[PDB]
Amino acid sequence: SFSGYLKLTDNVYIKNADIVEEAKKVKPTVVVNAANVYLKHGGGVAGALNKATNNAMQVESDDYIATNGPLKVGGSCVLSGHNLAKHCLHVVGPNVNKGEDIQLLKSAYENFNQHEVLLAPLLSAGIFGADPIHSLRVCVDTVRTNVYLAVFDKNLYDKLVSSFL
Numbered sequence: 005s006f007s008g009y010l011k012l013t014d015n016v017y018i019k020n021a022d023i024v025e026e027a028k029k030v031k032p033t034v035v036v037n038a039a040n041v042y043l044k045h046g047g048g049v050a051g052a053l054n055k056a057t058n059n060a061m062q063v064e065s066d067d068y069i070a071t072n073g074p075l076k077v078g079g080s081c082v083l084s085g086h087n088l089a090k091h092c093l094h095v096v097g098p099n100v101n102k103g104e105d106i107q108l109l110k111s112a113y114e115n116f117n118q119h120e121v122l123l124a125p126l127l128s129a130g131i132f133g134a135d136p137i138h139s140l141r142v143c144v145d146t147v148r149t150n151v152y153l154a155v156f157d158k159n160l161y162d163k164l165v166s167s168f169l
């Protein structure tokens with residue numbers, strides 16, 4: 005199971021780890037992707053997860069979009085986890101760099117409550133432009149299921165732990 009995590013709350017855990025390497029190791033039931041509404045997995049966590057699936061995540065995602073249309077910001081869909089996990093929960097946090105409403109971050113985290121345990125990144129962090137400290141706060145205050153957060157950047161991980169209220 006999950007190892008080396010620091011416990012932040014009753015249900016939230018955090019580790020300085022590459023979520024792809026973490027998923028390959030644990031093979032969790034659910035890995036969360038930091039998706040966009042089009043499921044175009046170009047960069048950040050999505051580009052890294054998709055590259056680890058040899059683009060199978062993108063091929064599956066294109067078929068999903070062709071059938072269903074785009075997701076909503078704050079929404080999600082469950083697709084295959086491919087070689088990384090049983091399922092991938094593609095969750096769309098607001099992209100501050102696209103001028104999207106940061107208030108949608110709580111709605112994005114609410115998707116995690118449909119799964120008992122998840123391996124996840126901080127939503128809207130990184131290339132999505134939100135403050136990762138704020139994302140962790142919304143995560144702790146929204147998610148009630150067991151969430152194992154993988155933070156790639158060591159310097160950000162240290163800042164998140166040291167500033168955690």
Ligand SMILES: CNCC(=O)Nc1cc(C)ccn1
Pocket residue numbers: 021022023024048049052125126130154155156157
């Ligand atoms: C291509 N490098 C892998 C990578 O960026 N992995 C990652 C990224 C974030 C933001 C969180 C956890 N893991």
